[PDB]
RNA sequence: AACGAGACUCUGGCAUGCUAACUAGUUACGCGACCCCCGAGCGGUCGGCGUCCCCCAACUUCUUAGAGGGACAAGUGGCGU
RNA sequence: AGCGUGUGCCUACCCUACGCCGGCAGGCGCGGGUAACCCGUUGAACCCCAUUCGUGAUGGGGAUCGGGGAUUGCAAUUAUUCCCCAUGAACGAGGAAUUCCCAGUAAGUGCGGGUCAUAAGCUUGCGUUGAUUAAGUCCCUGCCCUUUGUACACACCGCCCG
């Protein structure tokens, strides 16, 4: 039923998305196994090397 | 000797930041220790320059807000000063630890963006987490004082103490736990 | 405390014995903040006490000063009736006497049918104001036939 | 729509409570005394100055808009 | 090849470098005067306070305003048919 | 604090120190200024420190209305403006909608100029206290360029069928 929190590090910024340009699209590399990577959408201002907190790791999203 | 500055009365060296995502964005210790939460610095001139402002001055700026209070920064320094003196009597703890833990508990970490009544879930960045936390706990202090014999210095102390333990009596914790409930339904 | 009487009746009007003495007596018509302070200053009363803390002879000293200002050396420039039109006197008018003094003034203007008396009778603005856009108290009217 | 009914002068049931409650509170201030005893802020201001001259409480800080008091140097 | 754009004109921020001031000031003293002893130490040479007052003292930092100076994507690292 | 104005050339009025009388608005006397020279070191407001009130349409708010006193003017009633005592409304952050704004900026706060015999709730300038949020997009309303279609040229607010 339940799943744990994961932390992941920003490795590249890819562009801006949403109807008004509101969300940045970004690539992240996990803090446990450094060989893993995924892409995500983020609401606020973002910079390369920021650390995000993920409430689910298994979901992945393209262009909304 | 001049390497330690007590902010009038309170030490910075014993403070700890316990979320590794926020250590870069909550400015405390070292070059960020000052005597007063008031400077004339040009923090607005570039995108990430905002992150170099001491966290007690960011609380002081966000407090001089609601129309009749615009520009009145000298009044707003003494509200923060008398709130920290009440926090030390109630808790016995360092007031800077109570502020840092209230910021770490109050910032939301998932939210849902608007696309057409229709929404989609997205991640929140560490700079927007610290921006959201300050606005929520300033709003919580401001709404409680509006028709009570309680001063704003007492309401800002009550709001920070309840947020530092996550009690859900504070305005900031109820609003964080509303935003993450709504976004969890938009996955 | 003494559990003393905390509502009292002074000039056919009720005073709450619970406010500061200088703000309790302004419940009398004809007695504002400015006049109430000067009466208590001539009466030799301490302004710090609550209105239920006055003794029976202290309220009679205040009442006898309010009704005769000119004999306790309250100035002529302080008073609310100056050279009264029918008999030339100077005085302060209080309680139900102030209601009748206005009632006589509006009828005196109406009897000779001066412009003031007609505006007071038709219910219009009496001083210089415009009437096209302010003071509206009727109902919205539709254009339809 | 509602009304408070705060007292303007003490009675023994609340004045003996004022003297019994002194050690219980880490923070003593006119507003917390007002809401807890059902007392006006001007009577709460007056009552806390008497306890200071009796030596029963410590003044922590004073300013036009905010006084602060605390328990007598133990606990 | 022509007009618009840009250049151009006024304005803001820098000069202890220049020119030079009783319708602008500073510092200092021949000094002179009132007040305080708080000061090593006295009621003093010497200390403190001044839009208190002369200079036939010295000067231009603060004020005024004329001439010139200065910034070019010029220097270093990436990206670009 | 900073920007300004000042004896009106027909046209007949200017900016004010100091002393005295009056609670106040105001009155009398006597000097300076055609201005880096006199009002003037332009003792501005918010802000700052101490006091009183105590969650009450309240010592919040000040509309409406009675009586008296000065000043301008040839003349003040349909109240010119100003001063004093009294009276004490709606209003507890505003439905569907909708405006302006990116740094000494928004907003707060007061002061000059214009109009002026008498007089800003307007407008055009100046200083003072001083933030939150962005560093983007074409979704809504529009603009520029190219390809494309048309029965439009009065130009889509067009033309046209039973």
UniProtKB/Swiss-Prot annotation, chain A:
Lineage per the UniProt record: Eukaryota, Metazoa, Chordata, Craniata, Vertebrata
| Keywords on record | Acetylation, Cytoplasm, Endoplasmic reticulum, Nucleus, Phosphoprotein, Ribonucleoprotein, Ribosomal protein
Q: Which family does it belong to?
A: Belongs to the eukaryotic ribosomal protein eS28 family.
Keyword rRNA processing belongs to the record? no
Which Pfam families does its entry note?
Ribosomal_S28e
Q: What does this protein do?
A: Component of the small ribosomal subunit. The ribosome is a large ribonucleoprotein complex responsible for the synthesis of proteins in the cell. Part of the small subunit (SSU) processome, first precursor of the small eukaryotic ribosomal subunit. During the assembly of the SSU processome in the nucleolus, many ribosome biogenesis factors, an RNA chaperone and ribosomal proteins associate with the nascent pre-rRNA and work in concert to generate RNA folding, modifications, rearrangements and cleavage as well as targeted degradation of pre-ribosomal RNA by the RNA exosome.
Subunit structure, interactors included: Component of the 40S small ribosomal subunit. Part of the small subunit (SSU) processome, composed of more than 70 proteins and the RNA chaperone small nucleolar RNA (snoRNA) U3.
What Gene Ontology biological process does one annotation of this record name?
Answer: maturation of SSU-rRNA
Q: Which InterPro entries match?
A: NA-bd_OB-fold, Ribosomal_eS28, Ribosomal_eS28_CS
In the UniProt record, does the keyword Cytoplasm occur?
A: yes
> Mostly located where?
cytoplasm
Give a GO molecular function annotation for the protein.
Answer: structural constituent of ribosome
GO CC field: cytosolic ribosome; cytosolic small ribosomal subunit; nucleolus; rough endoplasmic reticulum; small-subunit processome; synapse
What CDD domains has UniProt attached to this entry?
S1_S28E (cd04457)
Curated annotation (Swiss-Prot), chain B:
Record PTM Phosphothreonine, positions in chain: 1
- Give the UniProt subcellular location, in the record's own words: Cytoplasm; Nucleus, Nucleolus
Write down which residues bear the modification named Phosphoserine. Answer: 125
Q: Which GO terms describe its molecular function?
A: RNA binding; structural constituent of ribosome
Instruction: Identify the GO cellular component terms for this protein.
Output: cytosolic ribosome; nucleolus; small ribosomal subunit
Keyword annotations from UniProtKB, A to Z = Acetylation, Cytoplasm, Isopeptide bond, Nucleus, Phosphoprotein, Ribonucleoprotein, Ribosomal protein, Ubl conjugation
GO biological process entries = translation
Which Gene3D superfamilies does the UniProt record give?
Ribosomal protein S7 domain
Annotated cross-link Glycyl lysine isopeptide (Lys-Gly) (interchain with G-Cter in SUMO2) - which positions?
A: 34
Query: Entry's InterPro entries?
Result: Ribosomal_uS7, Ribosomal_uS7_CS, Ribosomal_uS7_dom, Ribosomal_uS7_dom_sf, Ribosomal_uS7_euk/arc
Record PTM N6-acetyllysine, positions in chain = 34
- Describe the subunit structure: Component of the small ribosomal subunit. Part of the small subunit (SSU) processome, composed of more than 70 proteins and the RNA chaperone small nucleolar RNA (snoRNA) U3.
Family note: Belongs to the universal ribosomal protein uS7 family.
Record's protein name: Small ribosomal subunit protein uS7
- Which organism encodes this protein? Oryctolagus cuniculus
UniProtKB/Swiss-Prot annotation, chain C:
Q: Which GO terms label this protein's molecular function in UniProt?
A: rRNA binding; structural constituent of ribosome
Q: Name one GO biological process term.
A: translation
Residues with the modification N6-acetyllysine, per the entry, are 89, 101
Q: Which Pfam families match?
A: Ribosomal_S13
Q: Which Gene3D superfamilies match?
A: 1.10.8.50, 30s ribosomal protein s13, domain 2
Q: What is its main location?
A: cytoplasm
The alphabetical list of record keywords is: Acetylation, Cytoplasm, Isopeptide bond, Ribonucleoprotein, Ribosomal protein, RNA-binding, rRNA-binding, Ubl conjugation
From the record heading this protein, give the residue positions of the covalent cross-link Glycyl lysine isopeptide (Lys-Gly) (interchain with G-Cter in SUMO2): 86, 89, 101
Q: Which NCBIfam families match?
A: PRK04053.1
- Tell me its family: Belongs to the universal ribosomal protein uS13 family.
Quote the function comment for this protein: Component of the small ribosomal subunit. The ribosome is a large ribonucleoprotein complex responsible for the synthesis of proteins in the cell.
Could you give the subunit structure recorded for this chain?
Component of the small ribosomal subunit.
Q: Note the HAMAP family from the entry.
A: Ribosomal_uS13
Q: Tell me what this protein is called.
A: Small ribosomal subunit protein uS13
Q: Which organism is it from?
A: Oryctolagus cuniculus
Gene name linked to the record: RPS18
Curated annotation (Swiss-Prot), chain D:
Residues with N6-succinyllysine modification: 12, 54
Task of the protein: Component of the small ribosomal subunit. The ribosome is a large ribonucleoprotein complex responsible for the synthesis of proteins in the cell.
How does this polypeptide assemble, per the annotation?
Component of the small ribosomal subunit.
For this protein's source organism, the top of the classification is:
Eukaryota, Metazoa, Chordata, Craniata, Vertebrata
Disulfide topology? none
Instruction: State any single GO MF term.
Output: structural constituent of ribosome
Which subcellular locations apply to this protein? Cytoplasm
Superkingdom as given in the UniProt entry:
Eukaryota
Please provide the Gene Ontology terms (biological process) for this protein. Answer: ribosomal small subunit biogenesis; rRNA processing
What gene is this protein a product of? RPS25
Protein known as: Small ribosomal subunit protein eS25
Ribonucleoprotein keyword on record: yes
UniProt keywords, alphabetically: Acetylation, Cytoplasm, Ribonucleoprotein, Ribosomal protein
Name the family the entry cites: Belongs to the eukaryotic ribosomal protein eS25 family.
Major place of residence? cytoplasm
Recorded GO cellular component terms are:
cytosolic ribosome; cytosolic small ribosomal subunit; nucleolus; postsynaptic density
According to the UniProt record, list the residues that bear N6-acetyllysine. Answer: 3, 12, 20, 26, 54
Organism field: Oryctolagus cuniculus (Rabbit)
């Amino acid at each position: 039923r339940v799943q744990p929190i994961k932390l992941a590090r920003v490795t590249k910024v890819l562009g801006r998305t949403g109807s008004q340009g509101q969300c940045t699209q970004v690539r992240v590399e996990f803090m446990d196994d450094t060989s893993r990577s995924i892409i995500r959408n983020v609401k606020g201002p973002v910079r390369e090397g920021d650390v995000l907190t993920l409430l689910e790791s298994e979901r992945e999203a393209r262009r909304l | 000797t001049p390497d330690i500055k007590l902010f009038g009365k309170w030490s910075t060296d014993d403070v700890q930041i316990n979320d590794i995502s926020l250590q870069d964005y909550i400015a405390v210790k070292e070059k960020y220790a000052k005597y007063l939460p008031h400077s004339a610095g040009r923090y607005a001139a570039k995108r990430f320059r905002k992150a170099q402002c001491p966290i007690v001055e960011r609380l002081t700026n966000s407090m001089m807000m609601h129309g009749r209070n615009n520009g009145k920064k000298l009044m707003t320094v003494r509200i923060v000063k008398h709130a920290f003196e009440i926090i030390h009597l109630l808790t016995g703890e360092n007031p800077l630890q109570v502020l840092v833990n209230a910021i770490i508990n109050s910032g939301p970490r998932e939210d849902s963006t608007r696309i057409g009544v229709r929404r989609q879930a997205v991640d929140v960045s560490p700079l927007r987490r610290v921006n959201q936390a300050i606005w929520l706990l300033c709003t919580g202090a401001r709404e409680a004082a509006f028709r009570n014999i309680k001063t704003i210095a007492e309401c800002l102390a009550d709001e920070l103490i309840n947020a530092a333990k996550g009690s859900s009596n504070s305005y900031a914790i109820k609003k964080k736990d509303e935003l993450e409930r709504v976004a969890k339904s938009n996955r | 405390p003494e559990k003393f009487q905390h509502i009292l009746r002074v000039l056919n009007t009720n005073i709450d014995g619970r406010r500061k003495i200088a703000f309790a007596i302004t419940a009398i018509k004809g007695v504002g903040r400015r006049y109430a302070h000067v009466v208590l200053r001539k009466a030799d009363i301490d302004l710090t006490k609550r209105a239920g803390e006055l003794t029976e002879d202290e309220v009679e000293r205040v009442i006898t000063i309010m009704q005769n200002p000119r004999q306790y050396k309250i100035p002529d420039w302080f008073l609310n009736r100056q050279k009264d039109v029918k008999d030339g006197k100077y005085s302060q008018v209080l309680a139900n006497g102030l209601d009748n003094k206005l009632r006589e003034d509006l009828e005196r203007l109406k009897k000779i049918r001066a412009h003031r008396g007609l505006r007071h009778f038709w219910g219009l603005r009496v001083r210089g104001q415009h009437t096209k856009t302010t003071g509206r108290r009727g109902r919205t009217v539709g254009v339809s036939k | 729509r509602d009304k408070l009914n705060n007292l303007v002068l003490f009675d023994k049931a609340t004045y003996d409570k004022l003297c019994k409650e002194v050690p219980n509170y880490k923070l003593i201030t006119p507003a917390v005394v007002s809401e807890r005893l059902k007392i006006r802020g001007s009577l709460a201001r007056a009552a806390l100055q008497e306890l200071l001259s009796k030596g029963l409480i410590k003044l922590v800080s004073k300013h036009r808009a905010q006084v602060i008091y605390t328990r007598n140097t133990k606990g």
